Amino acid sequence: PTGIVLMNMGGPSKVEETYDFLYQLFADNDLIPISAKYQKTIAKYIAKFRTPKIEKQYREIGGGSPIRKWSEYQATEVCKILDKTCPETAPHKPYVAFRYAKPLTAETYKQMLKDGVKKAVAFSQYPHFSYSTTGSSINELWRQIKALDSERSISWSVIDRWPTNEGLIKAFSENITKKLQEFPQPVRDKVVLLFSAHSLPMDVVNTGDAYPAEVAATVYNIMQKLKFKNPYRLVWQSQVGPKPWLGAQTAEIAEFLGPKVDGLMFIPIAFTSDHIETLHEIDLGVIGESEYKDKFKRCESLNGNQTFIEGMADLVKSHLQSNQLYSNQLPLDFALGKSNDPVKDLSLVFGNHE
Template sequence: MLSSLYKTYSKTSVTNTIKRLNSTMPKKDKNGTAIVFMNMGGPSSVPEVKDFLYQLFSDYDLIPISKNYQPTIAKFISSFRSPKIEKQYAEIGGGSPIRHWSEYQASKVCEALDKTNPETAPHKPYVAFRYAQPLSKDTYKKLLEDGITRAVAFTQYPQFSYSTTGSSINELIRNKKDLDKDDQIAWSIIDRWPKNDGLTSAFAENIQAKIAEFKKEDPDFKEEDLTILFSAHSLPMDVINMGDSYPAEVGATVYSVMEKLNFNYKYRLVWQSQVGPKPWLGAQTADIVEQLNDPGKEKLILVPIAFTSDHIETLYELDLEVIGESKHPKNIKRCESLNGSETFIRGLIEECDHHLKNKTPFHKNLDLDFVLAKKDPNGNAPLRKFFTK
C-alpha cells in the first residue's frame, strides 16, 4: 500500500515539476522568426525603372507634393524622367544590385542567428522594398503564405528619417490592416543603428584600403593632403525643420568611423541627390568636390555613409558624375560600399542578436519621430499596438 502511494506521489510530482518548468521556459515558435530587410530598393532591370519612379514619387512621406493629387503627379513625373534614368541604369550594368546584396546579407544573418539564437530559430530571410520588387505588400503576402507568426522588421537605413524608415513603417502598418486583419504576425522593429560597431568598422576598413591605394600610387603622399568626404543622401529642409533625427544620426555614424581612424585625417559630412527647386540639406557633395579638387593637389575619398550596398547613387552619381566629371579624377577615390563585407555582416548579426534577446519592440525615440512628423503614434501610426515584442 505504502509502496503504491509512493509511486503515485513520485509520478505526480515529476509531472507537476515538468509542467512548472515548461511554463517558465521561453516558448519557441515552430515557424521561427522572419528577419525582414526593409529598404528603398532599386529596379533590377531597365524595364522596371518607370514603375520604380512611379512608386517613389507617389510616396507622400518621402516627397510631399500633394496628398490629393500625388499619384497623378507621380505618373507624369515618372513618364517624363524614365528615359533619362533608364540610360543611367543601362550605364551601370542594366539595373541596381541592391536586391542581390540585400538577399545575400539577410541570408547570412539568418544562418548565423540559427546558431546564436536557437530559441527564436529557424530564422527566415525576407526583403521588402518600398519602391521596387519585391514590394512590401508582396513580401507581406509571402510571410502570411509561409505561416510566419513572428517577424522583425530590420531597416537597412542605419540612420532614422521619417522620410525613409518612417515611410516603410507606415507602409507596413497599411499592409497589416489590409492583409493581416487576424493579426497572424507579431512584429518588432530595428528602426536605427547608426553607431553599430560592424557598420562603422567596415567603413573604417574600406577607407583604410583606399588610403593604402593612394600611398602605393604616390610615394610622396602626405596625410595632410587627404580629405575624407562622407556623402549621405540629402533631404528637403521642410523635413529637417520638423526635427527629423536623420542629420544627427548620420553625424553620429561619421564621428564613430573617424574615432576608429583616430581622427588622423581631415573630414567633412556632405549631402547628395538633391532634386527639385525646394531648399535641401547641404553642402552638396558635387560642389565641395569641385571646390577641393580644383587645385589638383588635394586627395579625396568619397564615403557613401548612409548606404549599405551599391546602387544608382554610388555607381552612377558618385562614380560617373561626381568623380567622372571632375577636373582631376585620379585624385578622387570612392570608398567601396559595404555589400558583402564580413565585418559589416557581423554587425548586422549582432544588431539582430541584441534585438531578439532584449525583446524591445522599437527604439524609445520612435514615438517622438512620429510626433514631430505630425503623425500621432496613437492615431495614424499606432506604434505600440503594432510593434508588440
C-alpha cells in the same frame, strides 16, 4: 517561423521597372512633400518625365539596380548566423521588402503568412532614421498588417536605427584605410574624406527629422577610430527639383576642392550596398567626369563585408534578446513626422495582439 525582413526604398532590377519604381517613389507623400492633396496625380507626370534619363543611367551601370541581389545576400547570410547564434529562435528565414522597388511589402507579407511565420522583425537597412525612409516604410507595414493580417497572426518588432553599431563602424574604417593605401604615402594623411549621404528636402529637415544628426554621429565615431588622421567633412548628394535641400552638395564641394586638394575620397556613409547613387552619381558623375579623376577615389561600399554582416547579426541578436519592438526615439519621430496616413499608435502595430 522567425522572419527577418531587410527593408529599404529599393531599386529597379531591370532597366524597365524604372517607370513603376519612379511613379511609386513620387506618389509617396511621406518621402518628398510635393502635394499633400495631389501627390499621386503629380507623380505619374514626374515619372513619365524622368524615366528616360534614369533608364539610361541603369544602362550605363550594367542594366539594373544591384540592391535586390545584395539585400538578399545580406539577409540570408545574417540568418545563417542567427541560426547558430540564437538557436532559441529556431530557423531564421531571410526576407526582403522594398518600399518602391520590386518585392513590395504586400508581396513579401503574403509569402510570410504562406510560410507560416509567427514572429517577425522589420529590419530597416538604413542605419540612420528618417521619417522619409524608415517612417514611410513603417506606415506601409501598418497598411499591410491591416489588409493582409487582420487576425494579427504575425508578431512584429522593428529595428529602427543603428548609427554606431560596432560592425558598421569597424567595417567602414577598414575599407576607408585600405582605400587610402591607393594614394601615395606622402599625401595619404592629406586626402580629404568626404562622407556623402543622400540629402533631404529642407521641408523634412525642418520638421525636426532625426536623420541629419544621426548620420553625423556615424561619421564622428568613424573618425575617432581613425584617430582623426585625415581632414573630413559630411556632405550630401542627390537632391531633385527647385525646392531647397541640405548642407553643402557633394558635387559642388568636390568641384570647389579639386584644385586645392592632394586628393579626395567619397564614402557611401548612409547606405549598405552599391546602387545608382555610388555606381553612377559618384563613379561616372562626380569622379568619372572631373578633370581630377586621378586624385579622386571612392571607398568600397559595405555589400558583403563580413565585419558588417557579423555586426548586423549581432545587432539582431541584441534586438531579439529584448523587449522594445522599437527604440525610445520612434514615438517622437511619429509625433514630428508629416503624413496623410500615419500610424497613430506604435503600440498597436508592433506586438503580439492575438
